[PDB]
Amino acid sequence: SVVSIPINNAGFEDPFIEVVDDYTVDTPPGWTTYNPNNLVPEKRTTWTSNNGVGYVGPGTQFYNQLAPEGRNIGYIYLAQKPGSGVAGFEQILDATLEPDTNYTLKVDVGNLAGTFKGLSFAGFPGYRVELLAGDTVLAADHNNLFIKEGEFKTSTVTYTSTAKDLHLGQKLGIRLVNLLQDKFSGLDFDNVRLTAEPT
Amino acid sequence: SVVSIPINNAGFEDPFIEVVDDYTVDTPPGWTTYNPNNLVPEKRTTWTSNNGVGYVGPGTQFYNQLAPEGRNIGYIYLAQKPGSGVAGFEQILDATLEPDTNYTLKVDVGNLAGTFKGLSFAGFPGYRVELLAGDTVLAADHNNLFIKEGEFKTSTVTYTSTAKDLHLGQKLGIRLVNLLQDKFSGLDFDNVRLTAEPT
Amino acid sequence: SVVSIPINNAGFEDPFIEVVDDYTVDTPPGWTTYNPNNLVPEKRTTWTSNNGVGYVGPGTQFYNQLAPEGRNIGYIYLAQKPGSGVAGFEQILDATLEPDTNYTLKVDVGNLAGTFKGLSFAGFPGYRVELLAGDTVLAADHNNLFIKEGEFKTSTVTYTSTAKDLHLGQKLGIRLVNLLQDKFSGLDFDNVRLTAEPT
Amino acid sequence: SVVSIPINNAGFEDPFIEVVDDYTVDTPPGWTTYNPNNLVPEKRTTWTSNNGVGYVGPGTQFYNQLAPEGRNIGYIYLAQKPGSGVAGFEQILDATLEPDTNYTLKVDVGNLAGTFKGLSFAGFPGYRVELLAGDTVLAADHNNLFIKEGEFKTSTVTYTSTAKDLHLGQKLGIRLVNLLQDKFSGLDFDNVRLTAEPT
Ligand SMILES: CC(=O)CCc1c[nH]c2ccccc12
Ligand SMILES: CC(=O)CCc1c[nH]c2ccccc12
Ligand SMILES: CC(=O)CCc1c[nH]c2ccccc12
Ligand SMILES: CC(=O)CCc1c[nH]c2ccccc12
Ligand SMILES: [Ca+2]
Ligand SMILES: [Ca+2]
Ligand SMILES: [Ca+2]
Ligand SMILES: [Ca+2]
Ligand SMILES: [Ca+2]
Numbered sequence: 001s002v003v004s005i006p007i008n009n010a011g012f013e014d015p016f017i018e019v020v021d022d023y024t025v026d027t028p029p030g031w032t033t034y035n036p037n038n039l040v041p042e043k044r045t046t047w048t049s050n051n052g053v054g055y056v057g058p059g060t061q062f063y064n065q066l067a068p069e070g071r072n073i074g075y076i077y078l079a080q081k082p083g084s085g086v087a088g089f090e091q092i093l094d095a096t097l098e099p100d101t102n103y104t105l106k107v108d109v110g111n112l113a114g115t116f117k118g119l120s121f122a123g124f125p126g127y128r129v130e131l132l133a134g135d136t137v138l139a140a141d142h143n144n145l146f147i148k149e150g151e152f153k154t155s156t157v158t159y160t161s162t163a164k165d166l167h168l169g170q171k172l173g174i175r176l177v178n179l180l181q182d183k184f185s186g187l188d189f190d191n192v193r194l195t196a197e198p199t
Numbered sequence: 200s201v202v203s204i205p206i207n208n209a210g211f212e213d214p215f216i217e218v219v220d221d222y223t224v225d226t227p228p229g230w231t232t233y234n235p236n237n238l239v240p241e242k243r244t245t246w247t248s249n250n251g252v253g254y255v256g257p258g259t260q261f262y263n264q265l266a267p268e269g270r271n272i273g274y275i276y277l278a279q280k281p282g283s284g285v286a287g288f289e290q291i292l293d294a295t296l297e298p299d300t301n302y303t304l305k306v307d308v309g310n311l312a313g314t315f316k317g318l319s320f321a322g323f324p325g326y327r328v329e330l331l332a333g334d335t336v337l338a339a340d341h342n343n344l345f346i347k348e349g350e351f352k353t354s355t356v357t358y359t360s361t362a363k364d365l366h367l368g369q370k371l372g373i374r375l376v377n378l379l380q381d382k383f384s385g386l387d388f389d390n391v392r393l394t395a396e397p398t
Numbered sequence: 399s400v401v402s403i404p405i406n407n408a409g410f411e412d413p414f415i416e417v418v419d420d421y422t423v424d425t426p427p428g429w430t431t432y433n434p435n436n437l438v439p440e441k442r443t444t445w446t447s448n449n450g451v452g453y454v455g456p457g458t459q460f461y462n463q464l465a466p467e468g469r470n471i472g473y474i475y476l477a478q479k480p481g482s483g484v485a486g487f488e489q490i491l492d493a494t495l496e497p498d499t500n501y502t503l504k505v506d507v508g509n510l511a512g513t514f515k516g517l518s519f520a521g522f523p524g525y526r527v528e529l530l531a532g533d534t535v536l537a538a539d540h541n542n543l544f545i546k547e548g549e550f551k552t553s554t555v556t557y558t559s560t561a562k563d564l565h566l567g568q569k570l571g572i573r574l575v576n577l578l579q580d581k582f583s584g585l586d587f588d589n590v591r592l593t594a595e596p597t
Numbered sequence: 598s599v600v601s602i603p604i605n606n607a608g609f610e611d612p613f614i615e616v617v618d619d620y621t622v623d624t625p626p627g628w629t630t631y632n633p634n635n636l637v638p639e640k641r642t643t644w645t646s647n648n649g650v651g652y653v654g655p656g657t658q659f660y661n662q663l664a665p666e667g668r669n670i671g672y673i674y675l676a677q678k679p680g681s682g683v684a685g686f687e688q689i690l691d692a693t694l695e696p697d698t699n700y701t702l703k704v705d706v707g708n709l710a711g712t713f714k715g716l717s718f719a720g721f722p723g724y725r726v727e728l729l730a731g732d733t734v735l736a737a738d739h740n741n742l743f744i745k746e747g748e749f750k751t752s753t754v755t756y757t758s759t760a761k762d763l764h765l766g767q768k769l770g771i772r773l774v775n776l777l778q779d780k781f782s783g784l785d786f787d788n789v790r791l792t793a794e795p796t
């Protein structure tokens with residue numbers, strides 16, 4: 001009776017990227033930029049904070065594995081110094097919070113590795129994965145997993161609704177957040193999945 | 200190889216309380232009131248927002264069990280309506296963040312049950328347990344456990360430091376947070392423990 | 399007496415670039431990539447050898463002046479080590495080599511300055527500017543100017559045709575070449591101009 | 598603070614030639630034959646590519662002036678058709694490239710005029726003058742000057758070293774190149790001078 005809640009572009013496979021380690025610098029289709037501190041500008045460049053999709057394919061210089069799912073990951077890179085705020089991806093779903101339901105949200109989180117011409121990718125900014133109803137964070141994993149350089153790990157967030165939950169009927173949502181707690185302050189997400197099961 | 204990090208009044212056993220289901224309305228010794236939204240006044244009653252310790256002893260009216268540890272729990276009760284903000288307890292420790300270390304923070308979180316003077320304690324405000332270095336939240340459990348009316352369940356929060364962590368040498372800290380996401384908007388904590396071991 | 403020979407996209411003003419210091423990684427329209435050593439890949443990323451246009455605008459991090467002309471410059475960046483070859487821009491013109499004519503080719507050449515997060519732009523690869531007829535290099539300036547970090551200088555290349563020049567009647571051409579003699583091995587060009595004067 | 602850099606046989610005065618318009622067919626002492634395309638054979642004759650020195654003295658048949666310097670010039674004659682490659686003279690010096698130094702190389706380049714035994718010396722193959730460090734061309738004048746039939750003109754090549762030049766400490770060199778871009782495909786050089794000056 002476990003049911004899949006549809007998420008748009010849940011594995012960041014849109015758009016198709018042809019070249020390994022190439023990437024876009026526009027919000028991935030189906031998602032919005034979560035930007036409570038306005039860290040990410042509307043027009044992004046190499047020199048600014050940005051997010052988008054990237055192709056982790058054979059020959060990749062960033063990971064010791066391929067993408068958790070398909071070709072692509074979704075990334076958020078913050079140029080501002082640690083402590084400046086947070087940003088990432090948000091998506092509000094069509095499904096709504098239902099009573100006496102177990103919700104299970106899984107997302108792979110990646111720590112990009114390596115080096116480019118004096119730029120180091122060592123380090124990680126921390127992550128948070130949030131399940132929302134309306135604009136309440138029902139449950140979140142704030143940086144509990146250790147993610148080695150050049151790997152992805154699956155974050156799992158759980159929530160059980162009761163028959164009289166205040167947020168019943170409000171739209172579900174997901175946020176994938178770069179915490180900007182350290183540098184290199186880029187991190188990746190992939191393979192977002194949300195299931196619901198009668199309790 | 201697992202080491203205990205000292206925490207003051209980690210079980211809220213101070214002060215001693217004589218009578219079952221009695222309680223204080225002042226910040227527990229060794230803790231401060233985490234009050235980022237000004238919900239808890241300096242001068243409390245039983246009918247303002249408050250915090251304190253409570254004796255969950257034999258035949259308690261609020262739980263199906265005794266305190267997780269010793270006689271007492273620590274409680275936070277917020278009178279303001281859901282969504283007004285958060286508050287709880289904070290303690291800054293003497294130990295500082297060390298590299299290549301796996302930190303494990305555990306706290307028992309209680310969901311009060313029953314009905315007292317015509318007030319129902321049905322419902323739960325949501326919790327967050329935070330592990331700090333300095334004023335940074337390294338890791339947190341934001342409301343992932345499902346806690347039935349009248350029971351405690353253990354929250355586990357984990358952080359792994361690296362060799363170059365920006366926060367090395369900063370004081371470790373703990374926050375125990377009432378999220379005020381619903382009513383009844385009181386919750387309990389007990390048996391705070393923090394360990395460290397080589398990664 | 400002196401006539402301007404038209405050149406397409408002679409100031410790299412196509413495409414339009416909105417944000418200061420942003421750039422493209424594709425061959426600018428009207429030009430081709432001069433690629434005698436195959437150093438520049440057909441499909442470029444931020445990480446590969448590349449060419450394109452770059453907006454040298456108010457508040458540029460790269461120069462102590464604005465673009466020699468308009469908004470943009472044309473750049474060629476080579477990732478391969480010094481000595482691996484050359485690459486740049488080429489444009490074959492409609493104009494043909496006429497007798498008893500003094501040709502004067504000028505181009506501004508830029509030595510990009512600064513740093514970004516560990517990337518260093520100190521150093522300069524060397525330049526060569528070539529005037530062609532057909533496949534023949536009639537005249538060239540191979541790296542005679544000294545160009546300080548963060549400025550542009552005008553290179554001038556001259557050829558005088560005789561009554562019975564072998565190449566008479568063949569199409570004129572221009573090449574702008576990154577010599578890859580040192581690092582940082584990026585350099586910029588702007589404001590290409592070619593004049594013809596009967597002798 | 599400008600200094601002369603010693604060059605051997607810098608005016609091609611060795612060997613002494615007694616009879617006006619007589620010449621040698623062997624590589625001038627102190628120079629080597631620059632031969633990247635094998636156009637000049639080890640054993641030279643009448644109908645072969647050759648180099649040598651030539652006495653441009655009173656009443657010379659080939660010029661409207663005496664030699665730029667002393668009695669002789671150095672010549673390079675290439676018998677192969679235009680486009681077959683290049684050849685000329687090379688000399689590696691004892692001086693090495695030093696930092697923060699302005700180098701100025703000057704060379705007189707000659708366009709032979711007239712007739713010799715029913716053969717027209719009209720036309721000119723083009724020249725290139727190169728300053729080297731090791732086997733890197735630091736700077737060159739590729740054919741920028743216009744040289745009338747029967748005259749010499751001074752080519753000036755300049756290079757400026759920085760503190761961190763990749764080629765620091767390598768031996769300076771000079772190349773004087775016949776480009777074989779047209780016929781009559783002989784040219785002459787004289788009076789090679791190289792100066793260095795702290796920048
Ligand atoms: C290097 C960055 O943090 C931004 C680009 C990026 C972040 N993650 C990626 C995965 C595959 C290709 C590109 C990327
Ligand atoms: C009803 C409250 O939230 C305040 C008192 C209280 C909160 N939790 C308790 C546990 C044992 C005894 C008293 C208490
Ligand atoms: C920094 C590089 O070498 C490639 C991009 C680039 C080279 N030159 C530039 C001028 C303005 C904006 C960007 C550029
Ligand atoms: C074109 C030639 O006669 C080859 C020898 C030569 C080339 N240039 C010269 C000038 C004076 C005397 C002889 C020569
Ligand atoms: Ca994917
Ligand atoms: Ca990393
Ligand atoms: Ca206790
Ligand atoms: Ca309750
Ligand atoms: Ca321009």
Ligand SMILES: [Ca+2]
Nearest residue numbers: 510519520521
């Ligand atoms: Ca530079």
Ligand SMILES: [Ca+2]
Nearest residue numbers: 608666667669
């Ligand atoms: Ca001489």
Ligand SMILES: [Ca+2]
Nearest residue numbers: 709718719720
């Ligand atoms: Ca001639």
